[PDB]
């Protein structure tokens, strides 16, 4: 099992939409908002037969974390949406073919990978070495400021690749993503 | 002719990416240099347009998602998804010979393709070539979504921004008089 790797813009209409509806029925809860949030970045796609079968996708965010020293950072993210495998083809290593791919893309173009996981995907990514994120989570709104997603607190794994020399990140502290419409993680 | 190839950051060779830094710093060439560690970061994460000639990287450019922050007349605010152009350069003694625009193209393919808007901060030499393609000239103040104030003001992109509005969501008037606002990073915001 090995997933292709290809942008939004070189995405056929037809496959995206084939993507969306396997991703949709996979989740059924997977809104209209969350399927935009997958849009912009690199798309890993695994078919049978003409059939989707797995996908997922990672695009660029911003994260923001402020060490003890009071040093803000805007870490460039490749952040993980939109991961599914169609329910018959499940505990076959797809979801694992999906995140090798996701995964090359990160260690690749970013400092840090992010995502906020479904209860099912939990131990994936504690297996594969993402790290849970402890500390409270956050959004930079427009007007309020930087506002609390209680929602989203101990739903959150990154994956430090390339942070800027001297930054370690303690996962008991506060991590803010840049603002979106629907879920902002 | 030449045509540009869409590379993806995670897919240069780091001597790949090297080279682009160094052909793109030497392009917008005192010691310090007009293109900084900061402008060349800005361009990674998203779509490079590489013309390679007889083992010379002869221009460049990178489309990086944003997010580009618009409240409406009507006073509703959108978070759009932004295709952000950086590191455009042709090497000086190929220039005038649709090597930028071979490498425009590129990059127009990948937002049409992929985001709602478009959005670069233009050299005021470059300001032309953007008209010409249907870019449109941003007239209104503009500003960055801080983390510790809020909106800040950045008066020294004003009049630099163009915008390319390919996939606006319904009902969306884009007035270029309002203000608009991006993402924060380090350096330069615009
Ligand atoms: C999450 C999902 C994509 C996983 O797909 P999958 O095909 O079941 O996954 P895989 O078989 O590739 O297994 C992924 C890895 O997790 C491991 N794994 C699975 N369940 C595990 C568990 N309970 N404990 C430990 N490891 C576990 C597997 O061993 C595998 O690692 P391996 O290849 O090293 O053995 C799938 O359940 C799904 O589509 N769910 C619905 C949509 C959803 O909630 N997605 C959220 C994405 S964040
Ligand atoms: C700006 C730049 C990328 C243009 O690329 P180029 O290959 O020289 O330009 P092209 O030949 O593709 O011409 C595209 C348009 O640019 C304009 N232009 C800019 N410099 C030009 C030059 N030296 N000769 C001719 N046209 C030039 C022309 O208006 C042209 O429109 P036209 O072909 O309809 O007349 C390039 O000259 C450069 O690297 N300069 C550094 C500044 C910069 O990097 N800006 C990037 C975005 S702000
Ligand atoms: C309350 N605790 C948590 C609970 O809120 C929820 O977390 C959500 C998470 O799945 C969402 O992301 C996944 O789901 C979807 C579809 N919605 C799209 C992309 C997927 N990666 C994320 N966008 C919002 C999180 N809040 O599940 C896990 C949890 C631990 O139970
Ligand atoms: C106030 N006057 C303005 C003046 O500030 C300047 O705008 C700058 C613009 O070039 C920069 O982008 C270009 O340059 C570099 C290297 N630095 C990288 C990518 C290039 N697209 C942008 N990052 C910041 C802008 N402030 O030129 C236009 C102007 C109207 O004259």
């Given at each position: 099992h090995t997933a292709r790797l290809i942008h939004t813009s070189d995405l056929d209409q037809e496959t995206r939409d084939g993507a969306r509806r396997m991703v949709i029925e996979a989740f059924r809860d997977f809104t209209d908002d969350d399927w935009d949030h997958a849009l912009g970045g690199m798309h890993a796609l695994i078919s049978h037969h003409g059939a989707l079968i797995a996908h997922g996708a990672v695009v660029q965010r911003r994260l923001m974390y402020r060490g003890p020293d009071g040093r803000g950072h805007a870490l460039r993210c490749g952040y993980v949406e939109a991961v599914a495998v169609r329910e018959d083809r499940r505990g076959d290593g797809l979801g694992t073919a999906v995140l090798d791919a996701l995964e090359q893309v990160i260690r690749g173009a970013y400092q840090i990978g992010a995502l906020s996981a479904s209860d099912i995907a939990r131990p994936m990514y504690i297996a594969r070495g993402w790290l849970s994120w402890e500390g409270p989570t956050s959004v930079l709104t427009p007007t309020e400021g930087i506002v609390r997603t209680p929602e989203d607190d101990r739903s959150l794994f990154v994956l430090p690749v390339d942070?800027?020399?001297?930054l370690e990140l303690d996962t008991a502290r506060e991590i803010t993503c840049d603002w979106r419409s629907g879920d902002p993680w």
């Open positions: 942070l800027p020399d001297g």
